[PDB]
Design a protein around this ligand. Structure first.
Ligand SMILES: O=c1ccn([C@@H]2O[C@H](COP(=O)(O)OP(=O)(O)O[C@H]3O[C@H](CO)[C@@H](O)[C@H](O)[C@H]3O)[C@@H](O)[C@H]2O)c(=O)[nH]1
Length: 607
């Protein structure tokens, strides 16, 4: 969402408050971003904007479907893109072309020129301030010649843009998890050693047969390499543990009962947190076995000392002719996460590159000081999130956690804890939310009636729902919600109790899932790991995919792609995140999909 406001303020006639303002109302119809990839909403939105914000917000209201817009019938940047016959527009453009030729491997293409041109324009608009900048904006919009010494203010700017795309990132820009990403790939890895984790929520069945069949194949295919499986004795019955222990012995699987591990330092903090989840899972008090696996992943005694890849228990592999024959590979970092990128079109510019991180495959090198640094860096992040639950939720950039902070049920929960001198733990939060969503009244009481009003499509009935809530008029809540579900309340007068009740159970389950997911993933999972990696990213200008850079290792995304991820370093094949530089439409794998640790699928994993 970073890039939205820029466009609005640079092409859509917004300013600060209406630029934000728009988005706060532009999303009430997620995914603003289709609109922005064409500039046709922004052209129209600027025409309306010219007659005030109300004129624009009224047009988005009465509009049938957005992105369905077709033309009708001191903004130095933006003025620079409107009408480049102006002498200075022409001079930056030529420089862009020169820049491209000294930075690329082939004949620069339109979008590649547009990218470097807008880079010049925004830089020149940042180098100018005051009246002379007002002058320049007037000069470009009255198309007269380049002022004296404009080509000397422009040289340091051009040399910076050029240097940024030709000089290899220095080691300060390649610090990943406290370890420099080195371009000579000194760290060695195994394509055969692997471990996975499985904590069963069913004491009579240690692991599903389908997953068991997968590890049998993994252990068979990975020749004499280790195929380790981490589990918990305390989650099984004696009978089932003995069954499990023999199945692994019979299939060349190295079992590791993490309950017997004696740990020090962060290892012990992760171990205790993990046992706490499992104990809460066992006691039906909000624990999650995937959260357990997220933390156990990073325990040094669990990983082991020889190079080894973590993989999700159900991960498949390219065994066959087109696998990797060599047992050893190399990369530039001790801990390799799974990575990829999605390309977002940006009209006449180059598409933005959005990197994705995942922990479904983590390739570890052998024991060494560096791998220990990067591991400790992750374990500390995850342990911190568990120690400061409310603080992380409060600061979270996740949409569902922001809304959780505004919920009155959440505030009540906190009040209980602080008044009861208890700290809000993750399992407690998860448990509370689950109970809250077990019925519509508790649900509506937890989220504000305001919240319930906007979601159900009638913000003005918020006071009404409050009264129906206060006096047990739970009929209006049912119909208000069902009415928003099945379009209109004429149709809800054709449902009886049974069919209406089943509709509200589905809805409530879906709402609970939206919060649950991030209450595992943002604390111990891949989103929590992602948050620890983001500082390594620029934060200034977006990352565009440059295709023929003479020195590709000047862009941080190309350094990760080549030197610090598992791509091309394992036989395991994951589709949980896109491959590198995957097209936006190609990421439509998402259309053809509840995971095994979400409350529904975990409900059934035992029952
Ligand atoms: O009953 C269970 C269910 C899950 N798991 C663990 O959770 C992992 C992921 O299960 P999966 O069903 O594949 O869910 P995903 O959504 O694919 O999981 C993502 O989200 C999880 C929680 O953040 C992470 O731990 C995973 O690595 C990440 O791939 C498994 O491999 C196990 O290690 C258990 O241990 N017991």
């Amino acid at each position: 969402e970073q890039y939205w406001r820029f466009k609005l303020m640079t092409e859509g006639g917004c300013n600060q408050n209406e630029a934000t303002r728009l988005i706060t109302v532009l999303k009430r119809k997620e995914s603003i971003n289709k609109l922005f990839e064409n500039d046709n909403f922004c052209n129209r939105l600027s025409s309306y904007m010219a007659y005030g914000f109300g004129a624009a917000e009224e047009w988005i209201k009465k509009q049938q479907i957005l992105s369905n817009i077709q033309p009708l019938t001191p903004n130095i940047f933006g003025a620079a893109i409107t009408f480049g016959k102006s002498p200075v527009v022409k001079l930056l453009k030529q420089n862009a072309r020169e820049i491209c030729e000294s930075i690329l491997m082939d004949e620069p293409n339109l979008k590649q020129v547009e990218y470097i041109f807008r880079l010049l324009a925004l830089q020149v608009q940042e180098t100018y301030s005051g009246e002379q900048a007002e002058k320049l904006y007037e000069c470009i919009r009255d198309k007269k010649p380049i002022p004296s010494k404009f080509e000397e203010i422009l040289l340091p700017i051009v040399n910076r843009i050029k240097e940024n795309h030709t000089e290899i990132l220095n080691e300060s820009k390649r610090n990943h998890l406290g370890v420099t990403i080195q371009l000579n790939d000194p760290y060695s890895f195994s394509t055969k050693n692997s471990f996975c984790i499985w904590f069963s929520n069913n004491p009579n069945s240690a692991m599903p047969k389908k997953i068991k069949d997968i590890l049998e194949e993994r252990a068979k295919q990975n020749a004499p390499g280790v195929t380790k499986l981490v589990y918990s004795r305390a989650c099984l019955t004696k009978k089932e543990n003995t069954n499990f222990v023999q199945w692994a012995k019979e299939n060349g699987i190295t079992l590791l009962d993490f309950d017997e591990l004696k740990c020090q330092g962060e290892d012990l903090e992760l171990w205790n947190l993990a046992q706490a989840e499992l104990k809460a899972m066992r006691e039906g008090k909000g624990g999650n076995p995937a959260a357990a696996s997220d933390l156990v992943r990073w325990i040094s005694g669990v990983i082991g000392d020889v190079p080894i890849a973590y993989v999700d228990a159900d991960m498949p592999m390219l065994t066959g002719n087109k696998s990797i024959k060599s047992e050893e590979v190399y990369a530039g970092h001790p801990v390799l996460l799974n990575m990829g990128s999605a390309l977002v079109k940006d009209g006449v510019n180059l598409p933005m590159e959005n990197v994705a991180f995942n922990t479904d495959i983590i390739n570890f090198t052998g024991e060494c000081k560096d791998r220990s640094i990067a591991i400790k860096r992750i374990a500390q992040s995850l342990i911190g999130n568990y120690l400061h639950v409310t603080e992380r939720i409060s600061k979270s950039g996740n949409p569902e956690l922001k809304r959780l902070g505004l919920m009155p049920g959440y505030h009540q929960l906190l009040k209980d804890c602080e008044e009861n001198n208890n700290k809000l733990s993750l399992p407690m939060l998860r448990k509370a939310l689950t109970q809250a969503h077990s019925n519509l009244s508790s649900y509506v009481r937890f989220i504000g009636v305001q919240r319930f009003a906007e979601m159900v499509g009638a913000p003005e009935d918020a006071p009404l729902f409050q009264e129906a809530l206060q006096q047990g008029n739970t009929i209006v809540l049912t119909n208000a919600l069902v009415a928003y579900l099945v379009h209109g309340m004429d149709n809800v007068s054709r449902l009886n109790s049974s069919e209406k009740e089943n509709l509200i159970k589905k809805y409530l389950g879906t709402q609970l899932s939206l919060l649950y997911k991030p209450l595992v993933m943002e604390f111990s999972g891949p989103c929590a790991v992602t948050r620890e990696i983001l500082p390594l990213l620029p934060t200034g200008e977006p990352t565009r995919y440059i295709e023929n850079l003479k020195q590709p290792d000047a862009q941080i995304l190309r350094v990760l792609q080549t030197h610090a991820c598992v791509a091309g370093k394992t036989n395991f094949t994951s589709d949980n995140i896109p491959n590198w530089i995957t097209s936006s439409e190609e990421v439509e794998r998402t259309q053809s999909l509840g995971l095994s640790w979400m409350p529904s699928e975990q409900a059934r994993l035992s029952k």
